[PDB]
Amino acid sequence: DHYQSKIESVYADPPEEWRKVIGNEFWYQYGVFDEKMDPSRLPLDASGRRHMEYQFELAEQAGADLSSQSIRRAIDIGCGWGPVLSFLAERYPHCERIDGVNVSRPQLEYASQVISREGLAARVRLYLCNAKDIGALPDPELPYDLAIFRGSLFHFTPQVLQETMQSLAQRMRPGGTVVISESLYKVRKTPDSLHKALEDNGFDVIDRRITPSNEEVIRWYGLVKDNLDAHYPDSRNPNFSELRDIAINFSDALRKDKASSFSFIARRR
């Protein structure tokens, strides 16, 4: 993968710096802003966690096997700073093995400290590994029950996507659940291109909808940009600048309804 070096370097700044920008829980793929969002926590932390929850409610409603004794091994593909690793360990205390995979070393070092200081090292495993290489993860005899792609697919070429889905198919039992959040154009990736790549690789889409709303995602980018303006006004950091560019330019594509955040719940055949 020739685009990995560019992905690694864009998430390379200190967690202390990123904390000011996206929240203390480091949720980095939008948020649901409804009556079940916690009003006590930072809007970004509460909405981001509420988005993950809402997606598991959609999955459950769509007929996915997400019961306590159905989830023995989960994988978080492009796990960022690790917010979903902690969330899975709490939602599934009897899940034996939660594997995070990421290409970003600084994200995994932070995730590693959080997992450790909350005594989750027993169950949560962190791998510096391209999503296309998940076929090389340990213990192939123990299949995946659950797979999360929270905002990770944007960074994938068609080839990496293909290889990631091939590899996950081979490592995932029939009926294992795939929970995907991604921003897609409705005219890089579209709903239909992603639907195709899933169905071409042994996955059935059982729920497919806009989530969160364009209104809510615009608001989420709002909160980020306010934090970016207050902490990095003078475009000192080229990575935070590039996030400002995206917050501005994608918010406008969302305003013109040229794109949306999509939830895809799929199921291994």
Ligand X SMILES: CC1=C(C)[C@@](C)(CC/C(C)=C/COP(=O)(O)OP(=O)(O)O)[C@H](C)[C@H]1C
Give the pair of three-digit tokens for residue 107: 């994200």
Supply the minimum distance, in Å, between the C-beta of residue 73 and ligand X: 24
Residue closer to ligand X by CB (options 230, 246) is 246
Residue closer to ligand X by CB (options 44, 115) is 44
- Positive or negative, the Cα torsion across 47, 50, 51, 52? positive
Supply the minimum distance, in Å, between the C-beta of residue 43 and ligand SAH: 16
Supply the minimum distance, in Å, between the C-beta of residue 155 and ligand X: 7
**Closest Cα to residue 265, out of 183, 206, 196, 191?**
206
**Closest Cα to residue 205, out of 75, 63, 31, 76?**
63
β-strand partners of 181: 150, 263
Q: How far is CA 15 from the centre of its chain?
A: 17
177 binds, among ligand SAH, ligand X, none (CB under 5 to 8 A by kind): none
Determine, following the binding rule CB under 6 A, whether residue 9 of this chain makes contact with ligand X.
no
Which x/- pattern, by CB under 6 A, does the window 182-211 give for ligand X?
A: -x----------------------------
252: left (phi > 0), else alpha (psi -120 to 50), else beta? alpha
Determine, following the binding rule CB under 6 A, whether residue 28 of this chain makes contact with ligand X.
yes
Distance of alpha carbon 214 from alpha carbon 220, whole angstroms:
10
Q: Which of residues 155-184 bind ligand X (CB under 6 A)?
A: 183
Determine, following the binding rule CB under 6 A, whether residue 154 of this chain makes contact with ligand X.
yes
Distance of alpha carbon 265 from alpha carbon 269, whole angstroms:
13
Determine, following the binding rule CB under 6 A, whether residue 102 of this chain makes contact with ligand X.
no
**Closest Cα to residue 151, out of 4, 238, 34, 261?**
261
Contact (CB, 8 A) for 184 and 194? yes
Supply the minimum distance, in Å, between the C-beta of residue 221 and ligand X: 8
Contact (CB, 8 A) for 32 and 212? yes
Give the pair of three-digit tokens for residue 114: 């959080």
Supply the minimum distance, in Å, between the C-beta of residue 177 and ligand SAH: 16
Determine, following the binding rule CB under 6 A, whether residue 104 of this chain makes contact with ligand X.
no
Residue closer to ligand X by CB (options 44, 134) is 44
- Residues contributing to the site for ligand SAH (CB under 6 A): 7, 11, 27-29, 78-80, 83, 101-104, 107, 130-131, 150-152, 155-156, 160
Residue closer to ligand X by CB (options 75, 217) is 217
The contact set with ligand X (CB under 6 A) reads 28-29, 151, 154, 183, 246, 249-250, 253
